[PDB]
Amino acid sequence: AKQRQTTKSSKRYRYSSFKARIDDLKIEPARNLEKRVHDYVESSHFLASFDQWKEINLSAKFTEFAAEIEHDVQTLPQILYHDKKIFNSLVSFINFHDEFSLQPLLDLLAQFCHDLGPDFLKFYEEAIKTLINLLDAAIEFESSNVFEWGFNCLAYIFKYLSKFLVKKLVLTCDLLIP
Amino acid sequence: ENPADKRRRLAKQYLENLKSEADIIASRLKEDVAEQQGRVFRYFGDKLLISEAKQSFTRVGENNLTCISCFQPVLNKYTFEESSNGDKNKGRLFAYTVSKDLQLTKYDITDFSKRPKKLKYAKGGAKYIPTSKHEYENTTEGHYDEILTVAASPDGKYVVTGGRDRKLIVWSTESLSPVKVIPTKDRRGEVLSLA
Amino acid sequence: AVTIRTRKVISNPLLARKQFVVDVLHPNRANVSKDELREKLAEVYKAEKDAVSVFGFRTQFGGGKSVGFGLVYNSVAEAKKFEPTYRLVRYGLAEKVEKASRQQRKQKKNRDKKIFGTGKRLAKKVARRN
Amino acid sequence: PRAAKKRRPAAKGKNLSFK
Amino acid sequence: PRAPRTYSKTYSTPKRPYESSRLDAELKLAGEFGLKNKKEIYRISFQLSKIRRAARDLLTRDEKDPKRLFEGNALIRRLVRVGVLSEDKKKLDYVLALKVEDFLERRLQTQVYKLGLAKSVHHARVLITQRHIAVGKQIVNIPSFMVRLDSEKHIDFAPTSPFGGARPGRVARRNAARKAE
Amino acid sequence: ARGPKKHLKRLAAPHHWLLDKLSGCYAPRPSAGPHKLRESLPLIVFLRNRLKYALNGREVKAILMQRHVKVDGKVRTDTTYPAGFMDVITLDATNENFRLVYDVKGRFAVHRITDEEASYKLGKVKKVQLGKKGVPYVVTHDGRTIRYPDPNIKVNDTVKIDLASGKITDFIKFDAGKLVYVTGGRNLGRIGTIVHKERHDGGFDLVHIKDSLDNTFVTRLNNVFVIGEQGKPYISLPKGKGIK
RNA sequence: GAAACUGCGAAUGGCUCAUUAAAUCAGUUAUCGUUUAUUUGAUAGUUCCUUUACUACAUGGUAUAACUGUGGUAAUUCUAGAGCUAAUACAUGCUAAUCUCGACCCUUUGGAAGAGAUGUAUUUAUUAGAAAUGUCUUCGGACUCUUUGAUG
Ligand SMILES: [Mg+2]
Ligand SMILES: [Mg+2]
Ligand SMILES: [Mg+2]
Ligand SMILES: [Mg+2]
Ligand SMILES: [Mg+2]
Ligand SMILES: [Mg+2]
């Protein structure tokens, strides 16, 4: 408590409390310099990440989510034409608060905003509200990974919608007051 | 104006075109990706009118024309640019023909009502017989035996030919100029079909 | 040219990776270095080279083909966490630990066994004695 | 009761060439 | 310790090796098929003896017996596959009628000689041992290789061979270089 | 020997594990647990030699220490934990639920099940007795001691145990015409309906079983496991339905 | 995090075939003839009982190592005297409950004046361990009786 883990042991694996992970965690996605799948795109950011997550994650909820939305994300016009249904499904599945499936869904939500930035504005209010409930839900089941995914999703949205949110920065602040 | 917005603009314009053409929009988007699913999605056989077909025959000086390959630009849904090699070739349909006369010819078939129109050609002959007599040295620019086959690259940038001269020559589309020769490196490796 | 194909791809969220059999066809070449394969599988799967490991390459008799195993971790941190230490050393992600040979360490262990406690008292006693 | 249905493989082979 | 790895002798010395007729037989077989020593003939004889003894045991058994049907069908299938037994003699009786010459004739050396890639059985052996012959996509450097019916049509010069379209061997380019200088 | 042994030779290991004879010199010795040594599948073999999720023992240890593996709804970290017959192995990360049931060949099969089916297991009632303070209890084949049982439950009957609470939801009596799974001997893995139970006082009872394909075979009562009523098993069966 | 105490292991592994002629060993039985670290599953509210003159918001050295310092022996994985200090070591020792009936009211989601009952562990002795075919009722149900289990 008084002294942090300043001197590291020779052990390769060390226990870390949930609070310990949270203290070290810092939300700044630009600081991370690992390769991003969405940097390489053939059709859209959403499809590029969506294909990757299908192959890594096998959770029950994400697999069900993929089946519903697989046919409607093959091409960027398809995403734009079907933006309403995609967003509702993303919000619906994030509401389940299933830790095994949050990481792909949250990542796709941010990339979804990337594909259609100005058009995501009509979705902006609902996305922030859903994240706030998830983070408030995240308190009861302790998982530092969940917080990192949620806030990084929040940070990404600000990055893509930087121009529009800045014009009404007070409005964005008002949502995050709680 | 990051690249993501550019795709959005082209997609937005593309969707507008479909709306101008026209459920229907929702369906039409599906047929765009129907190619990825390897199943029939072009049911038009009963719509064809064979009886009214406008048939025509165009004589060619070459003897025993052996094969023909046709190139058609196609719009790329992912990026929304035509497969045409250049701006001049926007929506120009080409057909390449080869014959036992060791001559490669290209024609313009864009105008359906009009007959094919020759543009350029390249002919081989005894000049191109390899001197070395070794298979890996059969790297002459032109053909010296019967050409059997020809194929047009989907990008519209290259045309490839092969025949009994056990070589695979790839030519520039506009000018039929050779750029590479790839011997099959076999005594009986006579190319019979290209796809 | 040289071709790579990944087959029998199994996703392993338990270890957070993808494990597959890598087949490399390299006509007119002796064989292909592991670092190149790491670079290129990294480009393929859209992951860091640090997160890609390859091993067990055996060239087929007669040459022209090689077969081995490959792993692609979801994140470089996961690879550092789960990979063997020696493989990390091969790729430079970890530094080789310098240690004495087994005989020297064992002899030191026996010598330390013979002495009880810190031993400074023994040192001062012998210093006084002589 | 029926057993759980097998899941089609999530991952598939993939290829490139260079040089 | 580690569990044993089993092994078995693949040949057996004949009963009376110094029989004059036997010596002449071995001479003729080696001359025809270019065999290196008597060990190869002994090996083929031992394999044939095993096959014929198994066929004998099966024939002794009553017809329509499960063991007879199963094992005879397997043996006929294998012998047909290797090509020794033809498609129209699929009976154990013709298995008892097999001879050493059939198995010798399926050797990759003899097949290479017959197909015309070589001018003699010894030339076929030399080509095989120098890595010039490929059965399909695989280079085979073993004269005792047994060629199946399907693999028979795929025997060819290996891509890497100087005869198969690769660059000339060291001697050829050495001579070309000195001639150039 | 002067005490319990702690090593197992590969050749001495159970055959049905299908362990390579040339891989090494020793095989995983199952630790003490619910199932006997010879009728158990240690988690290392299941994770490495059956599912192939791990390539070596250290990887299996790493997987287990992550607490990704649950046995009967409880997290286990022992590499040689003796999982056995009618054991439920859950891997949440892969969304996979397995039940250990022998195949017709006689080996444990990788049988995937749904969550609803994984929520329970079946246990053969090995013993019924009154404990201290006159509390009746039943001991099953997996070493589970369950108090306050139904009086009708007797030895050789099968109890459906809910993993979450470890209580008896239902039970099936041992009687002619009941569906039965063989867990021992050469007929191990077969499935059939009871026909008759031959009772010999002071000796091993014999049970005659009849398969769907009309074949009959006799097996000792100890190798019998009642799994439901004919045509209506209480657990999803593996491919082949225990035929031949 | 050296050292030391504590806990566990060291009774497994490996090697050899001296002794051994119903012995070992192979197959096959039994423990209703007994011990079993460990794993796994269950399992323990005893309210009260005069010096309450009372620690449980937590007791002692009835105690030492490591450590400081003074020494013996030619010599060892030898150790003496003195001084210190810990525990999941050693030795002590506590803190307004639950359950039967239930009169009387009240007629239920009922309240309860009151009559009663109270762990384990070891040793011995003893004990247990085997024509209600009616009546009414709302047609449901109620009225009297049952009361250990297993193995051959
Ligand atoms: Mg060579
Ligand atoms: Mg008995
Ligand atoms: Mg004697
Ligand atoms: Mg005896
Ligand atoms: Mg222990
Ligand atoms: Mg003292």
Q: Which domains does chain C have, with CATH numbers?
A: 3-113 (3.30.70.3370)
Contacts of D13 in chain C (CB under 8 A): 5-7, 9, 20
F104 with F65, same domain: the answer is yes
**Cβ atoms D16, C3 nearer than 8 A:** yes
Asked if residue F85 and residue F34 are part of one domain, the reply reads: yes
**Is A60 in Cβ contact with F95 (below 8 Å)?**
yes
Instruction: For residues F220 and F150, state if they share a domain.
Output: no
Interatomic CA distance for residues B90 and B101, integer angstroms:
31
- Token pair recorded at residue A155: 């940070």
Q: Count CB neighbours of B72 within 10 A.
A: 15
The reply to whether C120 Cβ lies less than 7 angstroms from strand G is yes
Sheet holding F88-91, edge to edge: F74-75, F69-71, F88-91, F96-102, F108-112
Resolution of the solved structure (Å): 3.9
Of B11, E32, F102, residue with least CA distance to A115: B11
- Ligand 5 centre to CA of B98 (Å) is 84
Q: What is the distance of C-alpha C60 from the center of its chain?
A: 24
F236 touching D (Cβ < 8 Å): yes
- Counted residue by residue, chain C has a size of 130
F223-238 exposure pattern, b = at least 16 Cβ within 10 A, e = fewer: bbbbbbeeeebbbbbb
Scan residues 175-234 of chain F and list those with Cβ within 7 Å of strand G. 199, 201-204
| Way it was determined | cryo-EM
Residue E50, by phi and psi: left (phi above 0), alpha (psi -120 to 50) or beta? alpha
| F3 CB below 7 A from strand G atoms | yes
Report helix angle A83-95 to A60-69, nearest 10.
Answer: 170
DSSP structure string for B47-59: G--STT-------
Chain F interface with E: residues with Cβ < 8 Å: 10-11, 21-22, 24-25
> Does an H or E element contain B103, and which?
strand B103-108
Structure tokens at F143: 């070493």
* Number of helical H runs and strand E runs in chain A: 10, 0
Instruction: Find the F32 Cα to ligand 5 centroid distance in Å.
Output: 11
Chain C residues close to D12, C-beta within 8 Å: 9
User: E36: which DSSP letter?
Assistant: S
F128 and F153 co-located in one domain: yes
C-alpha dist (Å) from residue A168 to A162, A163, A165? 10, 9, 5
**Which sign, positive or negative, has the C-alpha torsion F165, F170, F176, F179?**
negative
Judge contact between E162 and E169, C-beta under 8 A. yes
Nucleotides of G under 7 A from a protein CB: 1-4, 10-15, 29-30, 37-43, 66-73, 75, 77-79, 120-121, 148-152
Residues of A in contact with D11 (CB under 8 A): 55
Confirm if F26 and F45 have CB atoms less than 8 A apart: no
Sequence-distant (6+) residues with CB within 8 A of F174 are F154, F156, F157, F158, F194, F197, F224, F226
Give 3-state DSSP helix, strand, coil % of chain F, rounded to 5.
10, 35, 50
Structure tokens at E180: 């150039």
Q: Residue D14 in contact with residue C8, Cβ under 8 Å?
A: no
Are F153 and F86 in the same domain?
A: no
For F185, the domain range is 174-244
Query: What CATH number does the domain containing F27 carry?
Result: 3.10.290.10
Note the CA–C1' distance, F174 to G129, in angstroms.
28
Query: In whole angstroms, what is the distance from residue F152 CA to residue F174 CA?
Result: 11
Taking CA E167 as the corner, what is the angle to CA E163 and CA E171, rounded to the nearest 5 degrees?
85
Alpha-carbon span F243 to F220, nearest angstrom: 19
Q: Enter the tokens of residue B36.
A: 């990825």
Q: What is the CATH number of the domain that holds F224?
A: 2.30.30.30
Three-state DSSP class for A33? coil
Q: Give the domain CATH number at F134.
A: 2.40.50.740
Identify whether the C-beta of residue F181 lies closer than 8 Å to the C-beta of residue F191.
yes
Cα(F1) to centroid(ligand 5), Å: 19
Query: Considering just the CA atoms, what is the radius of gyration of chain D in Å?
Result: 17
Interatomic separation, CA of residue F134 and C1' of nucleotide G43, rounded (Å): 13
- Asked if A63 contacts A56 with a C-beta cutoff of 8 angstroms, the reply is no
List of E strands, F76-215: 82-84, 88-91, 96-102, 108-112, 120-130, 136-140, 145-147, 158-162, 167-172, 178-182, 191-198, 206-210
Find the residue closest to G12 using CA and C1' atoms.
F6
The tally of CA atoms less than 13 A away on the side-chain side of residue A89 is 21
Q: Which of F70, F87, F116 is where one domain is finished? A: F116
Half-sphere exposure of residue B189: CA atoms within 13 angstroms, side-chain side? 17
Determine the distance between A17 (CA) and G55 (C1') in angstroms: 37
Helix (H, G, I), strand (E, B) or coil at E124: helix
Residue B183, SS3 per DSSP: strand
Nucleotide nearest to C126 (CA to C1'): G71
Q: Are F212 and F243 in contact, with CB atoms under 8 Å apart?
A: yes
Distance CA C34, CA C12 (A): 23
State both tokens at F28: 């995983």
DSSP F31: P
On whether the CB atoms of residues D13 and C6 are closer than 8 A, the answer is: yes
CB F158 within 8 A of CB F233: no
Q: Does E48 reach chain C within 8 Å, measured CB to CB?
A: no
Residue type, B50: I
Range list of H helices, chain F: 43-45, 57-65, 115-118
Kindly list the strands in the beta sheet with B94-99, ordered across the sheet, starting from the edge strand earlier in the chain: B65-71, B94-99, B103-108, B117-123
Considering the domain architecture, whether residues F135 and F226 belong to the same structural domain is answered as no
C-alpha dist (Å) from residue B149 to B96, B167, D14, E18: 10, 11, 30, 66
F32 is near strand G: CB distance < 7 Å: yes
CA distance A90 to A86: 6
Q: Is C94 exposed, middle or buried (0-12, 13-18, 19+ CB in 10 A)?
A: middle
Whether the CB-CB separation of F177 and F193 falls below 8 Å is answered with yes
Which residues in C lie closer than 8 A to residue D15 (C-beta atoms)?
Answer: 3-6
Kind plus residue range of the DSSP H or E element containing E180: helix E170-180
Tell me if E75 sits within 8 A of E94, measured CB to CB.
Answer: no
Tokens of F220: 């000792």
Distance CA F66, CA F56 (A): 16
Residue F26 and residue F107 in one domain: yes
Point out which residues pair with B168 in neighbouring strands. B162, B182
Largest CA distance in chain F: 55
- Which contiguous run of DSSP H or E holds residue A125? helix A121-138
What does the DSSP 8-state code read for residue F46?
A: I
The rounded distance, in Å, linking the Cα atoms of C121 and E120 is: 90
> Does residue F242 contact residue D8 with C-beta atoms inside 8 Å?
no
CA distances from E32 to B107, C37, E18, E43, E113 (A): 62, 50, 21, 17, 11
Q: Judge if F183 and F77 occupy the same domain.
A: no
Say if residues A37 and A52 touch (Cβ distance below 8 Å): yes
Phi, psi of C25 (to 5 degrees): -100, 120
Residue type, E23: L
- Strands, E assignment, chain C: 2-12, 17-25, 52-59, 65-73
Final residue of a structural domain among F81, F98, F116: F116
Q: How far apart are the first and last CA of chain B?
A: 40
Provide the domain count of chain F: 3
Round to whole Å and give the CA distance between E100 and F177. Answer: 61
Count of helices and strands (H, E) across chain F: 3, 18
Q: Quote the Cα angle for A115-A102-A113, to 5°.
A: 15
Residues F139, F241 share a domain: no
Q: Among F63, F75, F78, which Cα is nearest to F29's?
A: F78
Q: Environment class of residue A175 by beta-carbon count within 10 Å: exposed (0-12), middle (13-18) or buried (19+)?
A: middle
Using the Cβ of A117 and the Cβ atoms of chain B, whether some distance falls under 8 Å is answered with yes
d(CA F208, CA C66): 56
Query: What residues of chain A have any CB closer than 8 angstroms to a CB in chain F?
Result: 13, 58-60, 63, 100
Q: Name the token pair of B20.
A: 């101008």
Output DSSP code: residue A144. H
Q: Which of F88, F114, F116 to mutate to test the interface with D (most CBs of D within 10 A)?
A: F114
Do F111 and F50 fall within a single domain? yes
Question: Distance in angstroms, CA of F148 to C1' of G104?
Answer: 38
Cβ neighbours of B119 (radius 10 Å): 14
C-alpha E103/C-alpha E85 separation (Å) is 10
Give all chains having 3 or more CB-to-CB distances under 8 Å with chain D: A, C, F
Q: Quick one: F183 and F222 in the same domain?
A: yes
Same domain, residue pair F11 and F69: yes
Q: How many Å apart are CA B97 and CA B103, to the nearest integer?
A: 8
Instruction: Output the CA angle A79-A83-A88, nearest 5 degrees.
Output: 130
Q: Note whether C66 and C76 are within 8 A (CB).
A: no
